[PDB]
Amino acid sequence: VNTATPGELTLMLYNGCLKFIRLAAQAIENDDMERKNENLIKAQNIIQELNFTLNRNIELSASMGAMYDYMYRRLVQANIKNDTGMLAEVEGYVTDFRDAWKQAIQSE
Amino acid sequence: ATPGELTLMLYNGCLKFIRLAAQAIENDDMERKNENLIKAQNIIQELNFTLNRNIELSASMGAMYDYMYRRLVQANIKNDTGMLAEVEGYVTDFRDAWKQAI
């Protein structure tokens, strides 16, 4: 909780993608078709996960980044003043981001 | 699998922790308030970092993701490990560059 490294999740997908590709190569060299297909399907899923997020993030642009900064800043300010009020406003913003993101998902 | 799930997951996680924090404050539970508020904060930085990088990589990285996707599909059909190695090289480069950004 105090040691979170911003950006590690994408890193994790990258590491996952590489393992699946490598496992896929081993599956082929050893006549294991089922394990080759499953791993490539998974390697493919990570790429599409990154692809989706990249594209949507480019559309949201820097103003969305300014939005995050604010929220982060507010949660810190709500944590120092025990202001459930500020948690309510931040919750209102995040709720719309999620619903909006949920849409962008189904929308394909 | 649904492309986009993981971010949806982060948003939902972030809402849970924000909500548990509101609960803690009312119960004068400073312990859990801090815990949950830091988690929600970590999620925001996680989303903020990714967004900032993705905008720097630009849409060109997007075309590269499509190609890689197609090469994998092709490599699966051809049982070609040379193609896998190719993609593996790109992903390793992108992962290192990201490991640096962090």
Curated annotation (Swiss-Prot), chain A:
Give the principal location in a single coarse category.
cytoplasm
Q: What does this protein do?
A: Essential for filament assembly. May act as a facilitator of flagellin (hag) secretion. Antagonizes translational repressor CsrA indirectly.
Localization, UniProt: Cytoplasm, Cytosol
Q: Which UniProt keywords apply?
A: Bacterial flagellum biogenesis, Chaperone, Cytoplasm
Q: If researchers knock out this gene, what phenotype do they report?
A: Severe defect in motility on agar plates, forms multiple short filament stubs on the cell surface, decreased expression of flagellin (hag), 30-fold decrease in Hag secretion. All phenotypes are partially suppressed by deletion of csrA, which increases translation of Hag.
Please report the organism this UniProt entry assigns to the protein.
Bacillus subtilis (strain 168)
Q: Which GO terms describe its cellular component?
A: cytosol
Assembly behavior: Homodimer. Interacts directly with flagellin (hag), forms a 3-way complex of Hag, FliS and FliW in which Flis and FliW do not directly interact.
The record's Gene Ontology biological-process terms are: bacterial-type flagellum assembly; bacterial-type flagellum-dependent cell motility
Shown residues in whole-protein numbering: 15 to 122 of 133
What lineage, starting at the top, does this entry show? Bacteria, Bacillati, Bacillota, Bacilli, Bacillales
Q: Which domain of life is it from?
A: Bacteria
Q: Is the keyword Transmembrane assigned to this protein?
A: no
Asked if the keyword NADP belongs to this entry, the reply reads no
Family affiliation:
Belongs to the FliS family.
Q: What is this protein called?
A: Flagellar secretion chaperone FliS
